[PDB]
Amino acid sequence: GSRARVYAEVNSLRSREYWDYEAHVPSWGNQDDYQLVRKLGRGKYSEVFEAINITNNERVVVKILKPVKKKKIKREVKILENLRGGTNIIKLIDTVKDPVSKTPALVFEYINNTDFKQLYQILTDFDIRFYMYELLKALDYCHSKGIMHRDVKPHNVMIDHQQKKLRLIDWGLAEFYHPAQEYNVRVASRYFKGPELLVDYQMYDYSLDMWSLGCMLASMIFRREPFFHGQDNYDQLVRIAKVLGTEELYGYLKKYHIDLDPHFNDILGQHSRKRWENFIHSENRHLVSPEALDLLDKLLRYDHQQRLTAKEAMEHPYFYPVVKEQS
């Protein structure tokens, strides 16, 4: 099998009510206190709006949930409650319903969103270190709380570049980690899916989020966004193997006794592992250092067990300038 190296038993060590989200009974407040101002986004099971709480003039985000998804609603709510006060996790202010339809909605703190496509082309070296450190705080926190985000990607990493604030949003795909549990591999954005997902390995853990974080780090320091740009899930793995190497992929599969879908045999080809320095050029050289490449190499590994944990990543020398500045 496989287990997480950290936080493996933390849900089993807590009360059942902590993780048994199907049994959770939210307290649903009144959505009539909120005035919707503008639509911010739409997903397949939700839409997000800027809103004002008319009772106190607070600006918030309201996420209106398509109500058919009862179990998934309880999951997201219970996870957000468990994460209350976590560093750099979006703050759930309240759980409300339209008092007539009973359609549920989540109310979050407002954050200014600096558009990531534009931001990621103008970050400094220190900015990347700073924001990656802030994102790692959120991931170490949720992992320590027994929760995998499973959808880490630029859209879900809200950065207010004016106030130097970061929030990890959209916990709708998040799940509780339980050792030996088999999880659905249909999670994360294509470009941020770990190799484990792409090879249909269900016994994954928090380390999935560390792959996604590694993909974000690579895109920031190299300026290629997304870094691994597959055309479909099959091609996604080919794009990874063209960097990490094919023999290296096969060694990972062997270690975990992973069966490979035979459609891959026609498309993977044969590829040597590439040096990370191959991605440096005049446009990104100022963002790349030996310590950035060492960190990245320890995140973007096939072997999920061998990837750095969020805490190990935070402790890496790449972040020393950040820690020193916040002291």
Ligand SMILES: O=C(O)c1cccc(Nc2nc(-c3ccccn3)cs2)c1
């Ligand atoms: O699902 C969630 O947890 C969640 C929580 C908060 C925000 C969002 N989603 C979005 N927020 C924006 C945004 C916010 C402020 C200014 C401009 N855009 C665009 S999409 C989703």
